[PDB]
């Protein structure tokens, strides 16, 4: 049996008042066969 479940919490929407944060970085990476990104 599974011990996991899902619960709805919110609509999918854009919030006009959202805080703006973060930066636009540019990084070389490879994606390995088990789904891990690796820095190059």
């Amino acid at each position: 049996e599974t011990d996991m479940w899902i619960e709805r919490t919110a609509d999918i929407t854009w919030e006009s008042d959202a805080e703006i944060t973060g930066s636009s970085e540019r990084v070389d990476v490879r994606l390995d066969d088990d789904g891990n990104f690796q820095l190059m």
Partner: protein, 147 residues
């Protein structure tokens, strides 16, 4: 029912979105475990370990991607908190198959699978598979594939 969901196991293991009757998350949040829902048990339909994507109830429905021009919002599904959106201009992971939009947003483990949306409120991908930079900063891919 279409919307944003928490994945529970109680504590929050991750998040995802229901769109067009299909539940979408990152592979690593459940590892393909079945999910109980208000509409009964959901079984994994398609998954890719390499892409870290997984959907339940039918094929991948999310058809939109980052346009490479605009800011995006993450609907942050933090454990123990109401959702809140944060807006950011993605950078990129540079890979051989093209660039992948990437966001410098650092939230708790329970937040993997939180959706990233464009200005039309369409889901362009999911948060929580990325890299740690040498200085310790986290950057997630906007994780997405074709519908």
């Amino acid at each position: 029912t279409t919307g944003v969901y928490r994945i529970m196991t109680s504590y929050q293991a991750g998040a995802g979105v229901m769109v067009e009757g299909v539940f979408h998350t990152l592979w690593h949040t459940t590892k393909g475990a079945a999910l109980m829902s208000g509409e009964g048990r959901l079984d994994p339909y398609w998954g890719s370990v390499k892409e870290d994507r997984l959907c339940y109830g039918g094929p991948w429905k999310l058809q939109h991607k980052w346009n490479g021009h605009d800011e995006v919002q993450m609907i942050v599904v933090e454990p123990g908190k109401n959702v809140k959106n944060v807006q950011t201009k993605p950078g990129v992971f540079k890979t051989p198959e093209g660039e992948i939009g990437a966001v410098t947003l650092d939230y708790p483990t329970g937040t993997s699978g939180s959706p990233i949306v464009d200005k039309n409120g369409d889901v362009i991908g999911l948060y929580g598979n990325g890299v740690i930079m040498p200085n310790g900063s986290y950057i997630s891919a906007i994780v997405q594939g074709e519908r």
